[PDB]
Write a protein that binds this ligand. Sequence first.
Ligand code: HEM
Ligand SMILES: CC[C@H]1OC(=O)[C@H](C)[C@@H](OC(=O)CCN(C)C)[C@@H](C)C[C@@H](C)C(=O)/C=C/[C@H]1C
Length: 393
Amino acid sequence: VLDLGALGQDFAADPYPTYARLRAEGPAHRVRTPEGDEVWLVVGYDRARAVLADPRFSKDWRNSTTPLTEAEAALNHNMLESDPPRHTRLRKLVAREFTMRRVELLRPRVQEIVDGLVDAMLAAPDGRADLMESLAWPLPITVISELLGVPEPDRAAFRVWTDAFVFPDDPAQAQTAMAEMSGYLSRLIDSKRGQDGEDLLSALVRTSDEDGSRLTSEELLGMAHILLVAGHETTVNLIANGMYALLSHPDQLAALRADMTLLDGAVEEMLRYEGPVESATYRFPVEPVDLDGTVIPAGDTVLVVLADAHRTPERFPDPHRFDIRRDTAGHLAFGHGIHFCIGAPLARLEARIAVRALLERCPDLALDVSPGELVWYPNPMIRGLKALPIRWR
Ligand code: HEM
Ligand SMILES: CC[C@H]1OC(=O)[C@H](C)[C@@H](OC(=O)CCN(C)C)[C@@H](C)C[C@@H](C)C(=O)/C=C/[C@H]1C
């Protein structure tokens, strides 16, 4: 049992040499997380990709030997914490909302949001700002909030609850937060009921009312939760981590600023090199699974380490090089298999717009701090910064 809490901020900041040295010793390893839970890491690209798609590794908490808390059990009837056939049905509900076509329709508004956020940011008197406060955070919360129908006065609460259960001081504190947000969401579902809003939460509340067999009240709260947590948190971190990647590689920043057709590939390499999902969501083996002689017990918690997958040199040569022109095909930053990210085109749309606007409107854009002054969150599932100080000319 490697104690990841004991490794401290050095591991949070640069966990890669740790995964890589585990990977050399075998595909799977028992570790304790900073919070105190024993889990399994699965490392190495080929094994990570296999495990992600393998039906022996379930997402349904009934297959876990760790009981849900009260507040969590209110929230688990969502597609990411389901297996077929419930998974199949939940995913089909919101299928269509996230295609490249429906997301294309959002390009104008996404642009307008960024255009505005970037205005405000430039109005800074000394040409200095924290990219997280100025753009990384507000852009995704705003986009997802409009989609779902979270009214403007309530959106502030989401950062706090989200930070609370994504990065708490104690598990006891995430509980309260989740209860509180879940409390909020029920009340927001109830407020939509038969009120004829055109947002997705109203469309879903409709579905549940019409045919509570296609969608239960509980699945309604779960779906609302899930769409909110990805639509801001991971996307915020893609934006901030990928900009950090660009800023700390002055050479690749110049290369993209010189040629914007390089943009889609740059965003892919930011997903590869500094993706916000360090480790995929909990997997639970239905039966014991032997991984090249290392047997994981049924019901244990298994974290597939996407970050280590992406530094696997036989898959991504010279893995420690951030190279915007690199072949990134087949990366796992949006997962793999039947739980593959539904929001991937939206995440991509937002990041691409945000990066282009920063490069085009912030002259001599640069990191305003040294890498050693950055603070990364210890949660082994999320790769993310506390602040990103930037400056421009
Ligand atoms: C950069 C941004 C994003 C990244 C890196 C990301 C990554 C991921 C990953 C790795 C998974 C699979 C988790 C696993 O297999 O354990 C996932 C699934 C999921 N994502 Fe995203 N995602 C992002 C943005 C979004 C957005 C904007 C939305 C909302 C539209 C969203 C909604 C979902 C949903 C509902 C699932 C569950 C899918 C299923 O179970 O079939 N994601 N995503
Ligand atoms: C939908 C994609 C998104 O995943 C999530 O929202 C996680 C499911 C979500 O986990 C839960 O909601 C737990 C609820 N059960 C305990 C009841 C999220 C908080 C996990 C976290 C690693 C993340 O930010 C994860 C973000 C992405 C991986």
